[PDB]
Design a protein around this nucleic acid. Structure first.
Lengths: 69, 97, 55, 120, 138, 126
RNA sequence: AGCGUGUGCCUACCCUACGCCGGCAGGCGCGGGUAACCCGUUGAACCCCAUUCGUGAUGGGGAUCGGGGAUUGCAAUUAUUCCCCAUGAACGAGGAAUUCCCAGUAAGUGCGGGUCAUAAGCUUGCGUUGAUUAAGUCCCUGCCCUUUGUACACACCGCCCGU
RNA sequence: AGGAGUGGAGCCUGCGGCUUAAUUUGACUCAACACGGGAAACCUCACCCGGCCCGGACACGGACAGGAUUGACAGAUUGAUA
């Protein structure tokens, strides 16, 4: 329909140019956290993404004990 | 002292021509509501008259962020002792009988 | 310079731009209804201004 | 100049308070008691109630002239649109402002504090 | 002159212009048990099963019914009909028949003339609300 | 391995071949930031970048640059070119790639280090 | 809903309607309001309603956390900024230790004011849905009114006895 | 013999000692600890990687035409169109 598609899961996305098809399930969390580019750009937000810390920055000590556990 | 001289002479002339004023307690402020439009920037003018009345030999009356100065005989006496200009340039004080 | 520095990137949240109209103090300001008094000076002058404690 | 009713009333109260404080510290030595403001068409009068009016007006009304001048030049009143008077208070012994000032000047003027307070 | 207090309760109001007219059976202008919220729809069917069809051939009660809140807008229609019958019977024949139908309606249920006086109360110092206080540490 | 293409697009011409897609294939995160407007002090980082890219050929990093400036660049695609930034007390550089749109230029300094832990005893610790 | 706020004296940092139509707050215009007058019958609303579970780890409630256009802020990341795709959150009463509370109350829920540039997870108010328990006692913690003892009066965190 | 709301199931702040530089001043039982209306990028910040502008009525030492204060991103200071 040539509609700019805001109905889909991942636009602009890495690992596939168009809204193409890829195989195997069990990886949706990985597909929402792309591990290659963030690791290769040497980012501290990269350590937020990778170590399990808060890439947005919720507060963790007692509250925010769901999100990294 | 943080004061120039040209604006100083101009402010002495303005103070001669007016004599009795009310001023706010500011130092670096060039925008005073009731003391604008003197052909000179208001920062130098307003601080200048504050320093003119606050040398150490003229009194004041101040609170609520505002200086009140009435022409006593100390004002005129210091006028004589410092500027040495006689009052025959008639001030605004010799009227309203 | 004065004109090369003033109002260049605006002070759209100036906190040192206001002070109590009575004591020249910057903390506890009450700008509601244009009072521009610190809270202590306002408690001092409230009866004179017209604010009274009914409840 | 258009201003909201709440802001207008609050500014009127602020003006009354500032004027009261200014002339309190100006002429409390002259038995200052209180100030009242009457705003009427083209007539904005300031009545200064004080115990002694000899120095409130001064000689030939000099002090009243200076007070009017400073009030007009500070609060931005139009020239000659404010005239401030001075009238005595009939009962000086029922005003705590006047009597606290009197006790202050009896304490400053030299007197045993118990004697000055019991006299008051 | 004109005596008109209509019906009201809590917040809502059924302006009841009482006069002569068609006076069909309608609530918010709508049928007997047909109201969309569908919760308290029987409260008006009860009385009209006793007198007969002739009695409501000349009582037009034009109602402006405005107000959100069931316990307000409902329970105000009963007040409104009670006052309508009261005024009609008082003005037309005598207050003895008004005495009788008001007796059955009001001794039937107390809560027409009386509303709930309960209302949200003021919040106070050092607490999230009226009575609760902030947690005190030691 | 061999070089991987950039979505099959051509970068031969600065304007006609590339930079046509402001948002068509390019994400947010400097989608509008570049269009916030302009101020003074902006072109000095770009001038130092042009110096460090012209005087110094590729495959050879230039002399050390150490400035804080966090600025807006009307373009967030800068291949063979990095902004070596002093942050905190130290200096940081990041190996850039021609896949940039989708991130910031200031999110690379680890400033939330685990602060020093004490040895609480004597009393009660739980 | 109701409590309220809102602009030209240093406030050129006010509240906003209506038209910009990438999908609506929105960077552009054009108007209203110094206010029971305009926002406003209060500009991406509660509780409710066959997206529905005839039982319950599912549709039923949000587990880090990516986008489509960005309220437009000297930085924001080293506190501003807006719906969603189902990859499961110990997903259905909680260590000794404790705080608050008696009806339109607790609790849930949002909206104003202050701070302020729209600045809130703070506070101060306002509504809205709306109870369970109790109409008692001096057991704990304390207070008060009497009698009583005291070697205390710095007043029991007192005074004081013996290597 | 009562309970309701669980400091651990649905959004951060105040304070107490130490990483070269951070846990930035009063208040510490009730009667301190989103309290100072204290939501600090500047401004009222003052544990900030280094500092520059100004101070002078009373007794003062170097007793006047330069004895240099704030405006250049380029071949630099550890930031700093000083």
């Amino acid at each position: 329909y040539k509609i700019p598609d805001w109905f889909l899961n991942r636009q602009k996305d890495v690992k596939d140019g168009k809204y193409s098809q890829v195989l195997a399930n069990g990886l949706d969390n990985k597909l929402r956290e792309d591990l290659e580019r963030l690791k290769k750009i040497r980012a501290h937000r990269g350590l937020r993404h990778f170590w399990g810390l808060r890439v947005r920055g919720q507060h963790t000590k007692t509250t925010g004990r769901r999100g990294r556990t | 002292m943080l004061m120039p001289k040209k604006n100083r002479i101009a402010i002495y002339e303005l103070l001669f021509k007016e004599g009795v004023m009310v001023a706010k307690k500011d130092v670096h402020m060039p925008k005073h509501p009731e003391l604008a439009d003197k052909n000179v920037p208001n920062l130098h003018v307003m601080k200048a008259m504050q320093s003119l009345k606050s040398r150490g030999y003229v009194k004041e009356q101040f609170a609520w962020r505002h200086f009140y100065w009435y022409l006593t005989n100390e004002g005129i006496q210091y006028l004589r002792d410092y500027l040495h200009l006689p009052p025959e340039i008639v001030p605004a004080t010799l009227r309203r009988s | 310079g004065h004109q090369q520095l003033y109002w260049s990137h605006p002070r759209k949240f100036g906190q040192g731009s206001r002070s109590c109209r009575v004591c020249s103090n910057r903390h506890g300001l009450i700008r509601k209804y244009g009072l521009n008094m610190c809270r202590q000076c306002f408690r001092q002058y409230a009866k004179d201004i017209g604010f009274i404690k009914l409840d | 100049v258009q201003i909201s009713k709440k802001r207008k009333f609050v500014a009127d109260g602020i003006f009354k308070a500032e004027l009261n404080e200014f002339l309190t510290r100006e002429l409390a030595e002259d038995g200052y008691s209180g100030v009242e403001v009457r705003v009427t068409p083209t007539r904005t009068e300031i009545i200064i109630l004080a115990t002694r009016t000899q120095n409130v007006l001064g000689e030939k009304g000099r002090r009243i002239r200076e007070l009017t001048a400073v009030v007009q030049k500070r609060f931005g009143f139009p020239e000659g649109s404010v005239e401030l008077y001075a009238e005595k208070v009939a009962t000086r012994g029922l005003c705590a402002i006047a009597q606290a000032e009197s006790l202050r000047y009896k304490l400053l003027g030299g007197l045993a504090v118990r004697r000055a307070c019991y006299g008051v | 002159q004109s005596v008109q207090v209509f019906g009201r309760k809590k917040t809502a109001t059924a302006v009841a212009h009482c006069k002569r007219g068609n006076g069909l059976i309608k609530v918010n202008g709508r049928p007997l048990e047909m109201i969309e919220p569908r919760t308290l729809q029987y409260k008006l069917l009860e009385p009209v099963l006793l007198l007969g069809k002739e009695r409501f051939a000349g009582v037009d009660i034009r109602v402006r019914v405005k107000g959100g809140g069931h316990v307000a807008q409902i329970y105000a229609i009963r007040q409104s009909i009670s006052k309508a019958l009261v005024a009609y019977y008082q003005k037309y024949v005598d207050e003895a028949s008004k005495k009788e139908i008001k007796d059955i309606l009001i001794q039937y249920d107390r809560t027409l003339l009386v509303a709930d006086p309960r209302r949200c109360e003021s919040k106070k110092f050092g607490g999230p609300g009226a009575r609760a206080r902030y947690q005190k540490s030691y | 391995f061999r070089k991987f293409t950039y979505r099959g697009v051509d970068l031969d011409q600065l304007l006609d071949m590339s930079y046509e897609q402001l948002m068509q294939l390019y994400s947010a995160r400097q989608r509008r930031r570049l269009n916030r407007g302009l101020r003074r002090k902006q072109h000095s980082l770009l001038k130092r970048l042009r110096k460090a890219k012209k005087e110094a050929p590729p495959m050879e990093k230039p002399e050390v640059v150490k400035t804080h400036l966090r600025d807006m660049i009307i373009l967030p695609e800068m291949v063979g070119s990095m902004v070596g930034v002093y942050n905190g007390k130290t200096f940081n550089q990041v190996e850039i790639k021609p896949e940039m749109i989708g991130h910031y230029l200031g999110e690379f300094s680890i400033t939330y280090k685990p602060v020093k832990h004490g040895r609480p005893g004597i009393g009660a610790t739980h």
